[PDB]
PDB file of C-alpha atoms in Angstrom:
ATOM      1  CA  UNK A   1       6.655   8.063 -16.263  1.00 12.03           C
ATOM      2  CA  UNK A   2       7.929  10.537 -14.403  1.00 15.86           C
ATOM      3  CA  UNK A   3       3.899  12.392 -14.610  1.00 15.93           C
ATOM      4  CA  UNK A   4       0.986   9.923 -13.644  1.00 18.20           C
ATOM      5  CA  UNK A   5      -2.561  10.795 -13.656  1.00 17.91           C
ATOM      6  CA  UNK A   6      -5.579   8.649 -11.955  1.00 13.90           C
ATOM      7  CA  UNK A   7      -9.249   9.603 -11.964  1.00 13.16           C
ATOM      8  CA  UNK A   8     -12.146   7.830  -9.756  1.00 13.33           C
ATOM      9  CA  UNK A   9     -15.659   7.883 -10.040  1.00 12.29           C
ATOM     10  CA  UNK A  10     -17.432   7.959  -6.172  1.00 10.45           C
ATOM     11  CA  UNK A  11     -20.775   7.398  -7.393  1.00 12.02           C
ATOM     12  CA  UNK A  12     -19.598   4.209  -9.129  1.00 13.20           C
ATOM     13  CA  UNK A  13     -16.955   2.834  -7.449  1.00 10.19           C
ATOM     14  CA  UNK A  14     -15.006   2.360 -10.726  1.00 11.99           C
ATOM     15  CA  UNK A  15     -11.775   4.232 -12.546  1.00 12.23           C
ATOM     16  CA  UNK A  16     -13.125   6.559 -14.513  1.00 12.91           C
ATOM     17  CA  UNK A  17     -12.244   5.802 -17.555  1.00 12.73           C
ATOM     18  CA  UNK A  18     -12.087   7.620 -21.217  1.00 13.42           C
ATOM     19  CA  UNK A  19     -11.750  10.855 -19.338  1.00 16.06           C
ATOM     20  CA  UNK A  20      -9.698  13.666 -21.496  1.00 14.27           C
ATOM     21  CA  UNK A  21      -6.951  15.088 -19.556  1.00 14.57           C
ATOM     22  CA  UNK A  22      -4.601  18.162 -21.021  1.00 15.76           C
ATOM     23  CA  UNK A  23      -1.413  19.156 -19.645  1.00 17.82           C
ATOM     24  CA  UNK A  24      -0.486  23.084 -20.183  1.00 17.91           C
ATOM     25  CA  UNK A  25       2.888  24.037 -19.455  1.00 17.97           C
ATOM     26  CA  UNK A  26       3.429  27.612 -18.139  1.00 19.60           C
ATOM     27  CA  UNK A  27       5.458  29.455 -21.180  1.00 20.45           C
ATOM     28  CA  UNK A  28       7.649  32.074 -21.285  1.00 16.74           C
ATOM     29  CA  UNK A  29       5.375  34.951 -21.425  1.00 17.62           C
ATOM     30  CA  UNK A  30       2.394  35.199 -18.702  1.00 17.10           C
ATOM     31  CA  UNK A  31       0.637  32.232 -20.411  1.00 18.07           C
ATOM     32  CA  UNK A  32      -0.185  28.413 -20.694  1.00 18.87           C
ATOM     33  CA  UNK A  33       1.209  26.150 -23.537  1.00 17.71           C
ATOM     34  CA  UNK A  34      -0.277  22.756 -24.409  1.00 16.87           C
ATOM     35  CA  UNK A  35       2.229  20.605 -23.143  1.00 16.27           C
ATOM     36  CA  UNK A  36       0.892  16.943 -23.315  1.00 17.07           C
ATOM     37  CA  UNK A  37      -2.504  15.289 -23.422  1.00 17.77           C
ATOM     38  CA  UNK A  38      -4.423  11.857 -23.288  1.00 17.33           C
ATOM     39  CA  UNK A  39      -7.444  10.076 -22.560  1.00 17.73           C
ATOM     40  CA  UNK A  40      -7.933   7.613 -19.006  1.00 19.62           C
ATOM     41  CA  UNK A  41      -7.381   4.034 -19.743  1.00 18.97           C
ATOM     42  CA  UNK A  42      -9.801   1.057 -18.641  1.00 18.34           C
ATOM     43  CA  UNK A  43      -7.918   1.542 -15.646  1.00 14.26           C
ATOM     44  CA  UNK A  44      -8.879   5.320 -15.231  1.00 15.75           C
ATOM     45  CA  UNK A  45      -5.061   5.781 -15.777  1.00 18.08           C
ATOM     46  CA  UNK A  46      -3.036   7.822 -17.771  1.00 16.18           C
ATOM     47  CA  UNK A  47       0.703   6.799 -18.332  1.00 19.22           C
ATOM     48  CA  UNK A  48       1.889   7.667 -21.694  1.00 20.59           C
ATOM     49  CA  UNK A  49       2.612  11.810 -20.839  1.00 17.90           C
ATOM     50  CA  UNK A  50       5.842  12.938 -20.950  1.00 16.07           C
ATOM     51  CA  UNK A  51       9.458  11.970 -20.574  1.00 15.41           C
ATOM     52  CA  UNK A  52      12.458  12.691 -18.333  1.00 18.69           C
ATOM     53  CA  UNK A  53      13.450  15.656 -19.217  1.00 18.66           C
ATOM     54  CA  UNK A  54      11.240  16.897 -21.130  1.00 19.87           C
ATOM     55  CA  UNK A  55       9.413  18.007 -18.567  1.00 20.12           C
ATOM     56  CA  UNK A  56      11.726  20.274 -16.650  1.00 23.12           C
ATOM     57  CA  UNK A  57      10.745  22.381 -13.913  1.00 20.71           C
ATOM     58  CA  UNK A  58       7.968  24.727 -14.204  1.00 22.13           C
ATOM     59  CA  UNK A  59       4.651  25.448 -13.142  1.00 24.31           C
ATOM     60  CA  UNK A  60       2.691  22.858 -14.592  1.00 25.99           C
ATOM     61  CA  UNK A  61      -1.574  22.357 -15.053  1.00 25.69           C
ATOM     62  CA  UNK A  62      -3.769  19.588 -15.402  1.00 23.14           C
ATOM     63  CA  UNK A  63      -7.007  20.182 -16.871  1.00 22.03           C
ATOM     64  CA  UNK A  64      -9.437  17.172 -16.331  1.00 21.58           C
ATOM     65  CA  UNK A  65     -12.447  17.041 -18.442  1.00 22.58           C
ATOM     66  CA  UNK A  66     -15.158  16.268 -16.133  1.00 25.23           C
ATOM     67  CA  UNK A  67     -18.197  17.900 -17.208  1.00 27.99           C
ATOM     68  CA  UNK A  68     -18.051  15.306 -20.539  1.00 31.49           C
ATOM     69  CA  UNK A  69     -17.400  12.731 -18.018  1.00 34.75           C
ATOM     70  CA  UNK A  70     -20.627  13.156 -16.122  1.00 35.39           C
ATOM     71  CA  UNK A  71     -22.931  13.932 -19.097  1.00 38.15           C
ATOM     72  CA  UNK A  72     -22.057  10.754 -20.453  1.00 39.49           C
ATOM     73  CA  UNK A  73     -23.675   8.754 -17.408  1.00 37.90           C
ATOM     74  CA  UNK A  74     -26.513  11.039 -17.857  1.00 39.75           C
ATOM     75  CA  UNK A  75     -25.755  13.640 -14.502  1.00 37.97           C
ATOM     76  CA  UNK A  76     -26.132  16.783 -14.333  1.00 39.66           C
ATOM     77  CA  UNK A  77     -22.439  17.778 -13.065  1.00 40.23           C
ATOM     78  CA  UNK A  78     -21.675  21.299 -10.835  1.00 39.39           C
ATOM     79  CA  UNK A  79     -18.181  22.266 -12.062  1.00 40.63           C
ATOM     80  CA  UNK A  80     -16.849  22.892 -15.977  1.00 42.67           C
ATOM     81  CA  UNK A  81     -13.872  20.820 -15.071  1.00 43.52           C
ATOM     82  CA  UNK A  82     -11.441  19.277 -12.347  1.00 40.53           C
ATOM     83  CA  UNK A  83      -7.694  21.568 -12.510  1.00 42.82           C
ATOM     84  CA  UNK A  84      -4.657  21.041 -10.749  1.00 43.32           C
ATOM     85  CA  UNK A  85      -1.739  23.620 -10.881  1.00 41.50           C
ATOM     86  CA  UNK A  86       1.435  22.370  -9.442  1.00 40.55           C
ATOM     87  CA  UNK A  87       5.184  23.883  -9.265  1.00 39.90           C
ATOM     88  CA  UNK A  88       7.752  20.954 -10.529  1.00 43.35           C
ATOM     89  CA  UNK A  89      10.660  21.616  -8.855  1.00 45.67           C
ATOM     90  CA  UNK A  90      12.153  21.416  -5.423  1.00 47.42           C
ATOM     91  CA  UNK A  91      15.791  20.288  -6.011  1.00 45.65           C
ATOM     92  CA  UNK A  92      15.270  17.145  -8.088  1.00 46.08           C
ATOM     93  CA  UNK A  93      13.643  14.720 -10.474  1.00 45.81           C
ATOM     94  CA  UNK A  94      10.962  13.384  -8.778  1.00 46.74           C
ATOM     95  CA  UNK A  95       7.360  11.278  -9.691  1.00 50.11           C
ATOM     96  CA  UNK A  96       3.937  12.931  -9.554  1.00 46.77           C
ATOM     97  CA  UNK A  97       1.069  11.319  -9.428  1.00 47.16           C
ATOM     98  CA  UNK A  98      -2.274  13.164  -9.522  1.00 51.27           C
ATOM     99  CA  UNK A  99      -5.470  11.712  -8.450  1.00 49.70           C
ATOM    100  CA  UNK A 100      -8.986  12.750  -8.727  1.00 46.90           C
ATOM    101  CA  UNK A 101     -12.203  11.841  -6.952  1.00 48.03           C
ATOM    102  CA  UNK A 102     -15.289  12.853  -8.918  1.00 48.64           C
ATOM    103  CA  UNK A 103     -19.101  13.426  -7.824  1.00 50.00           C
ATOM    104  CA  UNK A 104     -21.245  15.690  -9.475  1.00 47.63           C
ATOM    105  CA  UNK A 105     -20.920  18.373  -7.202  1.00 44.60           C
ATOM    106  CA  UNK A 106     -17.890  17.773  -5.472  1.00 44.74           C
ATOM    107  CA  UNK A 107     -13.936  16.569  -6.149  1.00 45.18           C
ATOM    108  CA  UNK A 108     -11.032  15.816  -4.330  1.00 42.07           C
ATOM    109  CA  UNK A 109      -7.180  16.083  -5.851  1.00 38.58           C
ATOM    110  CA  UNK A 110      -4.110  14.667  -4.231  1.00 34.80           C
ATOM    111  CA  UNK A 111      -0.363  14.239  -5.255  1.00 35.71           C
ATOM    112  CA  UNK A 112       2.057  11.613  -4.320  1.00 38.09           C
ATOM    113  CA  UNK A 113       5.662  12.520  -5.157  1.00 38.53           C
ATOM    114  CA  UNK A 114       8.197   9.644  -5.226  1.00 38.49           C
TER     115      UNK A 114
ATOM    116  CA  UNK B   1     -25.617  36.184  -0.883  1.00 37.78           C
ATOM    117  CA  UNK B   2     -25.825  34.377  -3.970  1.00 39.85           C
ATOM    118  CA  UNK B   3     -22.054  33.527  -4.003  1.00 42.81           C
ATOM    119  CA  UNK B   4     -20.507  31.981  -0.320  1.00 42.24           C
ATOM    120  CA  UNK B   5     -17.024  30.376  -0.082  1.00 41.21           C
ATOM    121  CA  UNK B   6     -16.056  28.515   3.255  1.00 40.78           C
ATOM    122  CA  UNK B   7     -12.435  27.436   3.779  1.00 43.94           C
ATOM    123  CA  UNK B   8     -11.452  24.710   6.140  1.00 45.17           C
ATOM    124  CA  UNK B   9      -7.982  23.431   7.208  1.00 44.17           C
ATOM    125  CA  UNK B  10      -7.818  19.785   7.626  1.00 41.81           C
ATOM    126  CA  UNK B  11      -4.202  19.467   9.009  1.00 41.60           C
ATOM    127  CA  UNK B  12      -4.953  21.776  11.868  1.00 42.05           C
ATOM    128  CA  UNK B  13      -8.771  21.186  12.141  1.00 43.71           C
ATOM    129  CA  UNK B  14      -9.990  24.855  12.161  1.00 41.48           C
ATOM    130  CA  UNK B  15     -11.340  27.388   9.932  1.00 43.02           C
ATOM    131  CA  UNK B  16      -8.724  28.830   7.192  1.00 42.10           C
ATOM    132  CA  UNK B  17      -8.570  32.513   8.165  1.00 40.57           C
ATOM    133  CA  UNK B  18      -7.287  35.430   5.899  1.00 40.08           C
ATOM    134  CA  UNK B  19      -7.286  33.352   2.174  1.00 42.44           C
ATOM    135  CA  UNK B  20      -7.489  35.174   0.004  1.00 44.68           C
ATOM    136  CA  UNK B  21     -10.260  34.717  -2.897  1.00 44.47           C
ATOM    137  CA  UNK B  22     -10.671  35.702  -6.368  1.00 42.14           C
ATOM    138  CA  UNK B  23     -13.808  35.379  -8.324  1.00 41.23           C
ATOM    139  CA  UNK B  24     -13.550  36.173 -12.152  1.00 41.47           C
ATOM    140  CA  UNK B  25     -16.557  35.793 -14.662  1.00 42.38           C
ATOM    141  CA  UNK B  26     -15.397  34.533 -17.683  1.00 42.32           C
ATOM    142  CA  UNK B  27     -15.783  37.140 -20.351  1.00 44.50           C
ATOM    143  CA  UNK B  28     -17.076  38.493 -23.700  1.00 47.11           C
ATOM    144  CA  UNK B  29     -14.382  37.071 -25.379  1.00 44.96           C
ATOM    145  CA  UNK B  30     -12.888  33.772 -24.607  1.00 41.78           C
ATOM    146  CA  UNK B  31     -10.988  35.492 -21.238  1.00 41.20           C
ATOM    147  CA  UNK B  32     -11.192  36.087 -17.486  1.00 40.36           C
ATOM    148  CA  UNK B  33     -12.517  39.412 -15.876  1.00 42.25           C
ATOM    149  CA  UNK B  34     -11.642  40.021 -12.088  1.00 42.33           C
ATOM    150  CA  UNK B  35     -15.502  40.387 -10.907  1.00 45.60           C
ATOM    151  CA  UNK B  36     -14.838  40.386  -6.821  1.00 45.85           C
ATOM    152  CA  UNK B  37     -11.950  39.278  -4.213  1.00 42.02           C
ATOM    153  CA  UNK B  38     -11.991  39.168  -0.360  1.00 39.69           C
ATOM    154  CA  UNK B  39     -10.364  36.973   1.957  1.00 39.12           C
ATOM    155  CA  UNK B  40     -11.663  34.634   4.908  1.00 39.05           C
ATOM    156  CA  UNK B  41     -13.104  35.618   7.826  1.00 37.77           C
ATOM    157  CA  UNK B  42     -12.672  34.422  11.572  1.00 39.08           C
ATOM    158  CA  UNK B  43     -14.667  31.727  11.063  1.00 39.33           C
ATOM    159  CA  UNK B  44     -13.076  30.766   7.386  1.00 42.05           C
ATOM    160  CA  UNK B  45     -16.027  32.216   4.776  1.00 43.13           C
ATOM    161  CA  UNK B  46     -16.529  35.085   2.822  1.00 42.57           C
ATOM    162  CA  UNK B  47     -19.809  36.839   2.294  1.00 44.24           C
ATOM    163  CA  UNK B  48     -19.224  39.926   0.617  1.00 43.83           C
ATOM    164  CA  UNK B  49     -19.313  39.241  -2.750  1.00 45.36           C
ATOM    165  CA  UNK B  50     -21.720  40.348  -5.181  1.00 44.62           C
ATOM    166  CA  UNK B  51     -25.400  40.963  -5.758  1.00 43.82           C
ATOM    167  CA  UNK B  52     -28.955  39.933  -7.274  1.00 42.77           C
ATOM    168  CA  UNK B  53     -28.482  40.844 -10.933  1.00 44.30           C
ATOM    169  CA  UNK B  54     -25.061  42.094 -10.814  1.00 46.58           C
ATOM    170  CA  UNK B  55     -24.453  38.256 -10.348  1.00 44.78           C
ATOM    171  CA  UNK B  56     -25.696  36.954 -14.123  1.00 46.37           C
ATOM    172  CA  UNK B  57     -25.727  34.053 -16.074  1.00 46.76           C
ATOM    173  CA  UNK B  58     -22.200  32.733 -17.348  1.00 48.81           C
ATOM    174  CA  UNK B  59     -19.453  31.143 -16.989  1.00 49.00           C
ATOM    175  CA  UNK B  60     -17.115  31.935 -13.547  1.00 48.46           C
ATOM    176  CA  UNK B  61     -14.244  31.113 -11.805  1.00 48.79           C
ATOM    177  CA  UNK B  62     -13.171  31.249  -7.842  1.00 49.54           C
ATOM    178  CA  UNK B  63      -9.408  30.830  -7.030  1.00 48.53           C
ATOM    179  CA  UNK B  64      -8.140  30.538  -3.786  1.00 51.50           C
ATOM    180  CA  UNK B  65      -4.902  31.484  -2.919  1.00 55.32           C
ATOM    181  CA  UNK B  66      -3.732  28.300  -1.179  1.00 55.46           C
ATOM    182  CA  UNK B  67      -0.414  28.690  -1.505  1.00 56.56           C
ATOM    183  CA  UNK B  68       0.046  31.375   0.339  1.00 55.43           C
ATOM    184  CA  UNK B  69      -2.099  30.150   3.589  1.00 55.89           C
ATOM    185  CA  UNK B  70       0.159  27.177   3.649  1.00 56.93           C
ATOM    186  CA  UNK B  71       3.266  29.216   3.135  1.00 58.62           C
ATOM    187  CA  UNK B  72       2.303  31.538   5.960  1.00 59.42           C
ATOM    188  CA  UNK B  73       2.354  28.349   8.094  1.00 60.43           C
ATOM    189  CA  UNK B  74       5.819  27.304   7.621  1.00 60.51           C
ATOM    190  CA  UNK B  75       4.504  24.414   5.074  1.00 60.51           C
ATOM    191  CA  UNK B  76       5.351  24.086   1.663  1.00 60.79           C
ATOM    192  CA  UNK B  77       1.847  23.150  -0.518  1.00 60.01           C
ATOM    193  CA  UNK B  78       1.921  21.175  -3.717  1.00 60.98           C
ATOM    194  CA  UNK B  79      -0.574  23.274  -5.478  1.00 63.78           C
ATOM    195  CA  UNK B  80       0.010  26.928  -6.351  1.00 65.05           C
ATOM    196  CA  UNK B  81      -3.969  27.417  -6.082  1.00 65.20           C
ATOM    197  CA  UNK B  82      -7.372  25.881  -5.693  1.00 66.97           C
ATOM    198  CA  UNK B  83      -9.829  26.879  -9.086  1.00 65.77           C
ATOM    199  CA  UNK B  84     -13.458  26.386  -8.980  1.00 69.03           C
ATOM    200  CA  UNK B  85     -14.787  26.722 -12.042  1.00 68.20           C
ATOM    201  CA  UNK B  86     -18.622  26.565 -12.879  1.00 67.57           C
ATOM    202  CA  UNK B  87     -21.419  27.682 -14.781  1.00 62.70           C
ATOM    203  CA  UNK B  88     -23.838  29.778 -12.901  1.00 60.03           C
ATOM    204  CA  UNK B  89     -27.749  30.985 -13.206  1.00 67.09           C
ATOM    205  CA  UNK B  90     -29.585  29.209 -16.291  1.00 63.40           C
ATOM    206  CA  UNK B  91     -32.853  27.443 -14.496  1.00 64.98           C
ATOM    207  CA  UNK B  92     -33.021  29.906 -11.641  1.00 65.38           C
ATOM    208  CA  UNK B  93     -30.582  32.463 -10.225  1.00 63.19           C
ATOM    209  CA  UNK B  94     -29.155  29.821  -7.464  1.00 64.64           C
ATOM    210  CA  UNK B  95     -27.395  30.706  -4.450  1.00 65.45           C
ATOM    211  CA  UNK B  96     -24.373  28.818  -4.476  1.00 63.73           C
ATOM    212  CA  UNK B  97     -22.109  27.873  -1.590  1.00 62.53           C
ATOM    213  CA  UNK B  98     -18.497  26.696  -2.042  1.00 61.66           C
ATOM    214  CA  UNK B  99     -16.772  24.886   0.103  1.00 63.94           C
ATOM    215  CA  UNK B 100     -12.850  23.780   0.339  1.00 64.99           C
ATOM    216  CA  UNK B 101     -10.995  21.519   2.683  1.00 66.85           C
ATOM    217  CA  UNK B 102      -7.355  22.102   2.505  1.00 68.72           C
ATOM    218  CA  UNK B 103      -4.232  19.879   2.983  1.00 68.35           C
ATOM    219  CA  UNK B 104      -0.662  20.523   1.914  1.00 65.89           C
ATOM    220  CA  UNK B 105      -1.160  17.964  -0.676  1.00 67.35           C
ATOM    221  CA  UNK B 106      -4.422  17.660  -1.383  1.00 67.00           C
ATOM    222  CA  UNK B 107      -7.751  19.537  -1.263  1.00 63.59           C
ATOM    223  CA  UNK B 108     -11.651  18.842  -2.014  1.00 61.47           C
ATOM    224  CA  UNK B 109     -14.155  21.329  -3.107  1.00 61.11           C
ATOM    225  CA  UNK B 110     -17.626  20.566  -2.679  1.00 63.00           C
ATOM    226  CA  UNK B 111     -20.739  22.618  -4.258  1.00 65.47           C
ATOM    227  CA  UNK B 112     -24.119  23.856  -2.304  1.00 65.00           C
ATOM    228  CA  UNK B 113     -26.916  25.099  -4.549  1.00 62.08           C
ATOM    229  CA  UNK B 114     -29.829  26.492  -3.702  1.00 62.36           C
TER     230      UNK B 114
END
Protein backbone atom coordinates (compact mmCIF):
# COMPACT_ATOMS: atom_id res chain seq x y z
CA UNK A 1 0.00 0.00 0.00
CA UNK A 2 1.15 2.70 -1.60
CA UNK A 3 0.42 4.91 2.18
CA UNK A 4 1.97 3.16 5.35
CA UNK A 5 1.68 4.42 8.76
CA UNK A 6 3.85 3.18 11.98
CA UNK A 7 3.55 4.54 15.51
CA UNK A 8 6.11 3.78 18.55
CA UNK A 9 5.78 4.18 22.04
CA UNK A 10 9.47 5.49 23.71
CA UNK A 11 8.40 5.04 27.12
CA UNK A 12 7.58 1.39 26.37
CA UNK A 13 9.60 0.19 23.88
CA UNK A 14 6.59 -1.36 22.07
CA UNK A 15 4.38 -0.44 18.68
CA UNK A 16 1.85 1.43 19.78
CA UNK A 17 -0.87 -0.21 19.06
CA UNK A 18 -4.89 0.55 18.76
CA UNK A 19 -3.93 4.10 17.99
CA UNK A 20 -6.72 5.97 15.66
CA UNK A 21 -5.20 7.51 12.73
CA UNK A 22 -7.39 9.78 10.05
CA UNK A 23 -6.29 10.70 6.74
CA UNK A 24 -7.84 14.21 5.36
CA UNK A 25 -7.35 14.90 1.88
CA UNK A 26 -7.02 18.60 0.89
CA UNK A 27 -10.41 19.32 -1.28
CA UNK A 28 -11.18 21.53 -3.77
CA UNK A 29 -12.10 24.52 -1.86
CA UNK A 30 -9.58 25.84 1.01
CA UNK A 31 -10.46 22.76 3.15
CA UNK A 32 -9.74 19.13 4.43
CA UNK A 33 -11.86 16.05 3.38
CA UNK A 34 -11.82 12.75 5.28
CA UNK A 35 -10.00 10.72 3.03
CA UNK A 36 -9.22 7.34 4.80
CA UNK A 37 -8.92 6.14 8.37
CA UNK A 38 -7.91 3.12 10.68
CA UNK A 39 -6.77 1.98 13.88
CA UNK A 40 -2.70 0.62 14.59
CA UNK A 41 -2.46 -3.07 14.49
CA UNK A 42 -0.64 -5.33 17.23
CA UNK A 43 2.14 -4.31 15.24
CA UNK A 44 1.53 -0.46 15.73
CA UNK A 45 0.93 -0.63 11.89
CA UNK A 46 -1.51 0.55 9.68
CA UNK A 47 -1.73 -1.03 6.10
CA UNK A 48 -5.19 -1.23 4.89
CA UNK A 49 -5.45 2.87 3.66
CA UNK A 50 -5.82 3.53 0.32
CA UNK A 51 -5.16 2.26 -3.16
CA UNK A 52 -3.15 3.18 -6.27
CA UNK A 53 -4.78 5.66 -7.60
CA UNK A 54 -6.98 6.61 -5.51
CA UNK A 55 -4.82 8.57 -3.89
CA UNK A 56 -3.54 10.97 -6.49
CA UNK A 57 -1.47 13.82 -5.83
CA UNK A 58 -2.41 16.33 -3.35
CA UNK A 59 -1.61 17.70 -0.17
CA UNK A 60 -2.35 15.08 2.12
CA UNK A 61 -2.71 15.00 6.42
CA UNK A 62 -2.34 12.52 8.94
CA UNK A 63 -3.96 13.10 12.11
CA UNK A 64 -2.67 10.65 14.88
CA UNK A 65 -4.70 10.34 17.92
CA UNK A 66 -2.31 10.54 20.66
CA UNK A 67 -3.81 12.18 23.50
CA UNK A 68 -6.34 8.80 23.74
CA UNK A 69 -3.22 6.93 23.35
CA UNK A 70 -1.54 8.23 26.46
CA UNK A 71 -4.64 8.46 28.72
CA UNK A 72 -5.10 4.96 28.26
CA UNK A 73 -1.65 4.05 30.04
CA UNK A 74 -2.72 6.46 32.59
CA UNK A 75 -0.17 9.74 31.46
CA UNK A 76 -0.84 12.84 31.45
CA UNK A 77 0.17 13.68 27.64
CA UNK A 78 1.39 17.54 26.41
CA UNK A 79 0.00 17.72 22.85
CA UNK A 80 -3.93 17.12 21.54
CA UNK A 81 -2.47 15.02 18.81
CA UNK A 82 0.59 13.96 16.53
CA UNK A 83 -0.13 15.66 12.54
CA UNK A 84 1.75 15.25 9.55
CA UNK A 85 0.97 17.33 6.35
CA UNK A 86 2.73 16.12 3.32
CA UNK A 87 2.55 17.16 -0.59
CA UNK A 88 2.13 13.71 -2.76
CA UNK A 89 3.61 14.44 -5.76
CA UNK A 90 6.99 14.97 -7.29
CA UNK A 91 6.76 13.29 -10.75
CA UNK A 92 5.58 9.80 -9.81
CA UNK A 93 3.91 7.05 -7.86
CA UNK A 94 5.86 6.54 -5.07
CA UNK A 95 5.50 4.72 -1.22
CA UNK A 96 5.15 6.76 1.97
CA UNK A 97 5.66 5.60 5.01
CA UNK A 98 5.04 7.75 8.11
CA UNK A 99 6.42 7.03 11.43
CA UNK A 100 5.84 8.37 14.80
CA UNK A 101 7.75 8.36 18.07
CA UNK A 102 5.55 9.19 21.05
CA UNK A 103 6.41 10.49 24.74
CA UNK A 104 4.19 12.48 26.63
CA UNK A 105 5.68 15.61 25.94
CA UNK A 106 7.54 15.12 22.97
CA UNK A 107 7.26 13.31 19.20
CA UNK A 108 9.24 12.72 16.37
CA UNK A 109 7.75 12.10 12.55
CA UNK A 110 9.73 10.80 9.64
CA UNK A 111 8.90 9.67 5.99
CA UNK A 112 10.52 7.11 3.89
CA UNK A 113 9.52 7.32 0.22
CA UNK A 114 10.24 4.24 -1.95
CA UNK B 1 7.01 34.89 28.33
CA UNK B 2 4.51 32.37 28.82
CA UNK B 3 4.74 31.09 25.17
CA UNK B 4 8.72 30.40 23.75
CA UNK B 5 9.42 28.50 20.48
CA UNK B 6 13.14 27.48 19.68
CA UNK B 7 13.97 26.15 16.20
CA UNK B 8 16.98 24.04 15.50
CA UNK B 9 18.39 22.68 12.19
CA UNK B 10 19.76 19.28 12.46
CA UNK B 11 21.22 18.90 8.88
CA UNK B 12 23.36 21.96 9.29
CA UNK B 13 23.73 21.93 13.14
CA UNK B 14 22.77 25.59 13.91
CA UNK B 15 19.93 27.59 14.99
CA UNK B 16 16.94 27.93 12.28
CA UNK B 17 16.91 31.69 11.66
CA UNK B 18 13.97 33.73 10.09
CA UNK B 19 10.92 30.76 10.41
CA UNK B 20 8.35 31.95 10.44
CA UNK B 21 5.64 31.09 13.30
CA UNK B 22 2.02 31.16 13.66
CA UNK B 23 0.19 30.72 16.86
CA UNK B 24 -3.71 30.44 16.59
CA UNK B 25 -6.07 29.78 19.67
CA UNK B 26 -8.63 27.63 18.73
CA UNK B 27 -11.90 29.47 18.85
CA UNK B 28 -15.50 30.04 20.04
CA UNK B 29 -16.72 27.91 17.58
CA UNK B 30 -15.08 24.77 16.47
CA UNK B 31 -12.26 27.08 14.31
CA UNK B 32 -8.81 28.66 14.37
CA UNK B 33 -8.15 32.43 15.25
CA UNK B 34 -4.65 33.90 14.23
CA UNK B 35 -3.65 35.04 17.99
CA UNK B 36 0.30 36.03 17.25
CA UNK B 37 3.14 35.31 14.46
CA UNK B 38 6.89 36.23 14.43
CA UNK B 39 9.72 34.54 13.03
CA UNK B 40 13.17 33.24 14.54
CA UNK B 41 15.71 35.13 15.80
CA UNK B 42 19.64 34.92 15.43
CA UNK B 43 19.84 32.45 17.75
CA UNK B 44 16.56 30.36 16.36
CA UNK B 45 13.63 31.42 19.17
CA UNK B 46 10.98 33.71 19.36
CA UNK B 47 9.97 35.65 22.42
CA UNK B 48 7.54 38.09 21.50
CA UNK B 49 4.47 36.56 21.74
CA UNK B 50 1.81 37.27 24.05
CA UNK B 51 1.04 38.15 27.64
CA UNK B 52 -0.19 37.20 31.32
CA UNK B 53 -3.95 37.04 30.82
CA UNK B 54 -4.13 37.86 27.27
CA UNK B 55 -2.65 34.23 27.12
CA UNK B 56 -5.97 32.14 28.59
CA UNK B 57 -7.08 28.85 29.01
CA UNK B 58 -7.92 26.83 25.69
CA UNK B 59 -7.12 25.07 23.15
CA UNK B 60 -3.98 26.45 20.66
CA UNK B 61 -2.05 25.77 17.88
CA UNK B 62 1.75 26.82 16.71
CA UNK B 63 2.69 26.17 13.01
CA UNK B 64 5.91 26.60 11.72
CA UNK B 65 6.53 27.34 8.38
CA UNK B 66 9.07 24.61 7.56
CA UNK B 67 8.69 24.49 4.23
CA UNK B 68 9.76 27.49 3.41
CA UNK B 69 13.20 27.44 5.62
CA UNK B 70 14.07 24.33 3.74
CA UNK B 71 13.07 25.77 0.42
CA UNK B 72 15.17 28.86 1.03
CA UNK B 73 18.07 26.36 1.32
CA UNK B 74 17.93 24.82 -1.98
CA UNK B 75 16.22 21.54 -0.27
CA UNK B 76 13.03 20.22 -1.01
CA UNK B 77 11.13 19.18 2.63
CA UNK B 78 8.57 16.43 2.86
CA UNK B 79 6.29 18.28 5.12
CA UNK B 80 4.49 21.47 4.12
CA UNK B 81 4.57 22.50 8.00
CA UNK B 82 5.31 21.54 11.56
CA UNK B 83 1.75 21.90 13.95
CA UNK B 84 1.94 21.90 17.61
CA UNK B 85 -1.12 21.57 18.95
CA UNK B 86 -1.93 21.67 22.79
CA UNK B 87 -4.10 22.58 25.47
CA UNK B 88 -2.87 25.37 27.58
CA UNK B 89 -3.53 26.92 31.32
CA UNK B 90 -6.05 24.63 33.42
CA UNK B 91 -3.90 23.81 36.84
CA UNK B 92 -1.80 26.94 36.65
CA UNK B 93 -1.08 29.47 33.90
CA UNK B 94 2.30 27.49 32.74
CA UNK B 95 4.99 28.92 30.83
CA UNK B 96 5.50 26.74 28.05
CA UNK B 97 8.56 26.32 25.86
CA UNK B 98 8.48 24.64 22.43
CA UNK B 99 11.05 23.26 20.89
CA UNK B 100 11.62 21.79 17.12
CA UNK B 101 14.50 20.02 15.51
CA UNK B 102 14.22 20.09 11.83
CA UNK B 103 15.30 17.71 8.99
CA UNK B 104 14.15 17.61 5.39
CA UNK B 105 12.32 14.54 6.24
CA UNK B 106 11.68 14.46 9.53
CA UNK B 107 11.26 16.69 12.61
CA UNK B 108 10.67 16.30 16.58
CA UNK B 109 8.93 18.70 18.79
CA UNK B 110 9.50 18.50 22.31
CA UNK B 111 7.40 20.43 25.19
CA UNK B 112 8.91 22.54 28.35
CA UNK B 113 6.39 23.47 31.03
CA UNK B 114 6.80 25.38 33.73
Amino acid sequence: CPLMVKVLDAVRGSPAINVAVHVFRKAADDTWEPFASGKTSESGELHGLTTEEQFVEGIYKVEIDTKSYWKALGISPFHEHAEVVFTANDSGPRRYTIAALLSPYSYSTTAVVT
